[PDB]
Amino acid sequence: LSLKKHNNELLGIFVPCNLPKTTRKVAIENFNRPSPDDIIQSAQLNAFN
Amino acid sequence: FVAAHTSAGKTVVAEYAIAMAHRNMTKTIYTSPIKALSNQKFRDFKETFDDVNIGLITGDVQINPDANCLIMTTEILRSMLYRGADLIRDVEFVIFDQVHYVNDQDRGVVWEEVIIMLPQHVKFILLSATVPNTYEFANWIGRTKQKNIYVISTPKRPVPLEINIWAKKELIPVINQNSEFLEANFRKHKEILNDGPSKKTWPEIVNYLRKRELLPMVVFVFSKKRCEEYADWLEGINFCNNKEKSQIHMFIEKSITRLKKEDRDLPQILKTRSLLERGIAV
Ligand SMILES: Nc1ncnc2c1ncn2[C@@H]1O[C@H](COP(=O)(O)OP(=O)(O)OP(=O)(O)O)[C@@H](O)[C@H]1O
Numbered sequence: 001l002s003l004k005k006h007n008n009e010l011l012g013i014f015v016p017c018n019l020p021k022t023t024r025k026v027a028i029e030n031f032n033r034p035s036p037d038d039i040i041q042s043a044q045l046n047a048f049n
Numbered sequence: 050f051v052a053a054h055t056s057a058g059k060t061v062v063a064e065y066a067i068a069m070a071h072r073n074m075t076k077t078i079y080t081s082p083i084k085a086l087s088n089q090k091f092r093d094f095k096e097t098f099d100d101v102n103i104g105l106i107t108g109d110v111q112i113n114p115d116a117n118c119l120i121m122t123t124e125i126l127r128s129m130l131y132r133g134a135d136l137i138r139d140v141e142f143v144i145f146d147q148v149h150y151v152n153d154q155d156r157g158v159v160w161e162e163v164i165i166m167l168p169q170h171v172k173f174i175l176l177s178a179t180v181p182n183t184y185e186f187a188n189w190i191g192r193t194k195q196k197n198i199y200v201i202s203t204p205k206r207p208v209p210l211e212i213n214i215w216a217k218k219e220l221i222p223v224i225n226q227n228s229e230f231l232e233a234n235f236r237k238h239k240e241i242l243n244d245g246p247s248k249k250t251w252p253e254i255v256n257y258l259r260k261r262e263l264l265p266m267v268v269f270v271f272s273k274k275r276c277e278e279y280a281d282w283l284e285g286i287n288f289c290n291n292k293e294k295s296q297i298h299m300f301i302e303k304s305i306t307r308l309k310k311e312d313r314d315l316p317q318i319l320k321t322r323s324l325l326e327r328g329i330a331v
Contacts, residue, residue, distance in 0.1 A: 040074055043073055047074075
């Protein structure tokens with residue numbers, strides 16, 4: 001029962017134990033913005049219809 | 050398709066195409082039939098554009114192959130297409146300059162093969178002069194590639210030309226700027242004259258035109274040996290006062306540094322240096 005209530009942390013991606021909420025929020029905010037490929041693909045639409 | 054007279058501003062179209070490609074983050078390829086013009090156009094584009102990387106691909110050199118703007122020869126593009134290069138997928142515009150010089154036999158097959166092998170996502174820009182066979186090239190391209198192409202032509206030369214005749218220390222205008230022959234002037238030219246140049250002929254012209262503020266001159270002589278004799282006949286004539294000579298000397302000294310020390314003493318280099326200090330060259 002310990003494993004069932006402790007999922008999404010026992011089997012997740014690595015996040016450091018003592019991470020301040022500010023740093024976590026900054027990390028989350030970066031990935032909510034376009035990736036380098038997204039910007040280039042956005043502009044190429046006008047060229048190749 | 051642009052077919053305008055010479056010195057009308059055809060290179061403005063290519064610059065705008067390059068700017069459009071830079072704005073859209075795509076690639077452009079520039080091609081000329083003659084390898085001599087590739088270096089000059091490379092230098093001109095490098096001077097003109099500062100935010101756009103320029104590259105060159107010839108049979109002798111290869112500079113910045115990964116740049117967004119590439120200048121190459123037609124055969125280089127043919128080999129690249131045969132190899133199936135991955136950069137072709139990003140190319141938006143291909144520009145062919147001096148199309149009217151491709152009507153040869155060796156220059157004709159490669160141009161047609163390159164046109165045939167190009168993919169369907171590439172647009173075309175064509176520049177040349179006024180030639181009798183203009184609509185056929187555009188029709189063939191638009192039929193083979195199934196693309197819409199517009200043929201644009203200019204009415205007349207932006208700058209007008211006149212034809213004159215020189216005889217016995219004066220100049221007779223015989224054709225005006227409207228390309229209308231003047232019979233009376235030719236008759237007067239026939240009357241006043243009633244073989245080859247003499248030793249006192251080119252001095253008789255380098256002074257008449259100098260005082261008329263029409264100095265920049267190009268003389269066409271159809272002989273390698275006669276040009277040197279004509280240049281040597283001009284003695285005691287200069288155009289550099291005190292600083293132009295020093296600047297030309299510095300430019301020559303810096304330029305020929307790439308040669309070896311014993312290769313800078315050749316008689317041709319010395320004669321060219323001596324002539325260039327006075328504003329005369331062959
Ligand atoms: N609309 C314009 N008004 C004033 N000047 C212009 C205009 N268009 C071009 N020019 C000038 O013309 C000059 C050179 O013209 P250009 O080299 O394009 O002629 P060209 O047709 O390409 O000659 P060629 O037959 O050798 O290819 C440029 O320096 C440019 O400043």
